[PDB]
C-alpha cells in the first residue's frame, strides 16, 4: 500500500548520483576548455577592420548617432535544385507499415483552418498515434554444444532462409509459414558397393542387409560428443544409410562407429494485377481455392504443387533473343526464367558481356549509365550517357515496397508538398522511391515522352521496367508518362517543354 517510500527511495538514490556525475563532468569540462584556451593563446589572428547600396543602423538608446555603411555585394553563386536525402537501391526493399507518425510535418506558421484540418486528418490515418501525443539452440561449433534433433539443429536455417533470394532474412519476401519448402523432394538414397574400407560398416555381419531395409550386427566402445551426435542426425536425414560418407563428413568417427550409432538411434522413440505468393496445399491440387488460380498468376518453380501441374509456367524453347511476342515469356509480360528457359540462353552467360537472351535485362540489372543533372523541365532530371535504340531496357524503377495504406499515409504529405515518388506495382504493393531508390527516380513527366514503364513478372516478383519508347540520342533527358488522372497531371506535373 505505502509504495511511496520505495519510489521516493529510488528518486533519492538517483538525485545523489546525478550531482556526483554533474560535478565530476564539470571538472572534465574545465580541463578540456583549458587545453582549447591554451591552443588559442598561441595564435595571432588579424583584427577585423572597418570598410553600391547603403545600410543604416539606428540606435534606440540616446547618445548614439545612427551609422551608415555602403554594402559590399556578395558574388552570384551557381544554384543546384532541391533534393531531400535518399539511399541507393538496385532491387526493391520491402517495408512494414508505420504505427506511429514520426512527427508533424512543418508547413508554415499561417492561420489556415484547412491546414489545421489537414493535420487532424493526417494524425487520424495513424489513429491518433503521433510521437509525443497524450529459447535458442547453443552453437554446435562451441564448447556448449548439446545433442539435439536434426529438425532442431537446422531450425534457424530452415526458418530464416529465403528459397527465392538465396539469402537469410531477405529484404524482399515474408516468411514461408509452410515447411514443405525445406522438405527434399528427390531423395538421394545410396549405399556404397565396395568398402571404404578398413573400418567400413559393410564388413560387419548383417550390416548391408539392415542398410537396404531402411532407405544382430556386433558391438566392437566410443564416446560421442553432443555435437557429433547432432551432426549425425543432420547428415542421416540427407545421406541416409550411406555411412561411408557420413563418417567422412564427421571425420571424428569411423564408418563402423557411425553405423553402430545409427542402429542405436533406430531403437529410439481483369486490368488489375495481383501479387504472387507460392501455393502449398499438400493434399488438394491447384483448383479454385489455390491462391495462384485465384489471383490469376502462374504457379512457379517456388510452388509446392506436384511438378506436373498445369498452372505452372513452362518457360520457353526459343532459339532467338526473346524480345518479340514470338517468345511465350515475352508475350506473358515475363522475363525468361533461368531454370526453365534452357534453349534461349537465359540459364547461362553469367560472366559473358553479351547475353544471348534479351528477355533477362531486369533480373540481371543490365541498366544503362544514367547521369544526374538539373532538368530542363522541373527540378533534377535523368540524362542518358550513351545512345539507346527503341525498346531497349534503360533501368528498373526501384524503391521501398509499401502497402496501399502505407502509400496513402505517405502520399498524404507527398501531395501537400507537391512532390511524389510513389509508383503502383500491383493491387498489393506500391514502389516508393522517396527514401531509397536509383537515378531513374528523377525521370520527369511528359505527355509526349521518350520512355515507357512496364510492370513485368520477374522470377516471382513484379518489377517496374523503364524502356526506350523510340531511339534516344546520348545526353538526352528522360521522360515518361506518369499516367496520372487528367486533373492530377495539370496539378502536379504541369510543365511541358
Amino acid at each position: 500500500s505505502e509504495y511511496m517510500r520505495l519510489r521516493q527511495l529510488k528518486r533519492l538514490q538517483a538525485n545523489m548520483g546525478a550531482k556526483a556525475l554533474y560535478v565530476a563532468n564539470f571538472a572534465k569540462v574545465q580541463e578540456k576548455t583549458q587545453i582549447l584556451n591554451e591552443e588559442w593563446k598561441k595564435l595571432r589572428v588579424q583584427p577585423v577592420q572597418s570598410m553600391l547600396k547603403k545600410c543604416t543602423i539606428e540606435s534606440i538608446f540616446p547618445g548614439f548617432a545612427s551609422q551608415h555603411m555602403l554594402m559590399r555585394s556578395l558574388n552570384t553563386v551557381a544554384l543546384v535544385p532541391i533534393m531531400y536525402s535518399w539511399s541507393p537501391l538496385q532491387q526493391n526493399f520491402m517495408v512494414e507499415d508505420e504505427t506511429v507518425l514520426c512527427n508533424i510535418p512543418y508547413m508554415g506558421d499561417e492561420v489556415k483552418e484547412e491546414d489545421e484540418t489537414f493535420i487532424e486528418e493526417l494524425i487520424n490515418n495513424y489513429d491518433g498515434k503521433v510521437h509525443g501525443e497524450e529459447q535458442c539452440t547453443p552453437n554446435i561449433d562451441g564448447p556448449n554444444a548439446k545433442s539435439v534433433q536434426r529438425e532442431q539443429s537446422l531450425h534457424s536455417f530452415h526458418t530464416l532462409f529465403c528459397r527465392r533470394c538465396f539469402k537469410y532474412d531477405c529484404f524482399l519476401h515474408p516468411f514461408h509459414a509452410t515447411p514443405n519448402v525445406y522438405k527434399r523432394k528427390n531423395k538421394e538414397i545410396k549405399i556404397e558397393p565396395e568398402p571404404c574400407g578398413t573400418d567400413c560398416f559393410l564388413l560387419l555381419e548383417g550390416a548391408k542387409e539392415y542398410a537396404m531395409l531402411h532407405n544382430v550386427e556386433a558391438p566392437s566402445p566410443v564416446e560421442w560428443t553432443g555435437a557429433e551426435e547432432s551432426l549425425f542426425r543432420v547428415f542421416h536425414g540427407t545421406y541416409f544409410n550411406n555411412f561411408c560418407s557420413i563418417a567422412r563428413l564427421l571425420g571424428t568417427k569411423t564408418c563402423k562407429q557411425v553405423f553402430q550409432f545409427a542402429v542405436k538411434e533406430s531403437l529410439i522413440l481483369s486490368t488489375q494485377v495481383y501479387n504472387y505468393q507460392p501455393c502449398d496445399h499438400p493434399d488438394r491440387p491447384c483448383d479454385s481455392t489455390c491462391p495462384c488460380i485465384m489471383t490469376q498468376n502462374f504457379c512457379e518453380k517456388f510452388c509446392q504443387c506436384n511438378p506436373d501441374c498445369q498452372n505452372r509456367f513452362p518457360g520457353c524453347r526459343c532459339k532467338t533473343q526473346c524480345n518479340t511476342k514470338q517468345c511465350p515469356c515475352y508475350l506473358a509480360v515475363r522475363e525468361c526464367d533461368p531454370d526453365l528457359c534452357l534453349t534461349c540462353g537465359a540459364s547461362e552467360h553469367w560472366d559473358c558481356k553479351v547475353v544471348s537472351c534479351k528477355n533477362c535485362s531486369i533480373q540481371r540489372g543490365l541498366k544503362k549509365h544514367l547521369l544526374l543533372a538539373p532538368s530542363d523541365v522541373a527540378g533534377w532530371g535523368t540524362f542518358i550517357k550513351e545512345s539507346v535504340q527503341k525498346n531497349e531496357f534503360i533501368s528498373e524503377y526501384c524503391g521501398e515496397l509499401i502497402s496501399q495504406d502505407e502509400a496513402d499515409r505517405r502520399g498524404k504529405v507527398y501531395d501537400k508538398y507537391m512532390s511524389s515518388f510513389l509508383f503502383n506495382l500491383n493491387n498489393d504493393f506500391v514502389v516508393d522511391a522517396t527514401r531509397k531508390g536509383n537515378k531513374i527516380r528523377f525521370a520527369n513527366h511528359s505527355v509526349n515522352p521518350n520512355c515507357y514503364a512496364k510492370v513485368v513478372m520477374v522470377n516471382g516478383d513484379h518489377r517496374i521496367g523503364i524502356f526506350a519508347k523510340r531511339a534516344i540520342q546520348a545526353g538526352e533527358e528522360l521522360f515518361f508518362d506518369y499516367r496520372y488522372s487528367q486533373a492530377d497531371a495539370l496539378k502536379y506535373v504541369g510543365i511541358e517543354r
Partner: peptide, 10 residues
C-alpha cells in the same frame, strides 16, 4: 484518401 501514383499501361 487515394494519393497520386505513377502508373504503367496494364
Amino acid at each position: 484518401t487515394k494519393a497520386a501514383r505513377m502508373s504503367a499501361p496494364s
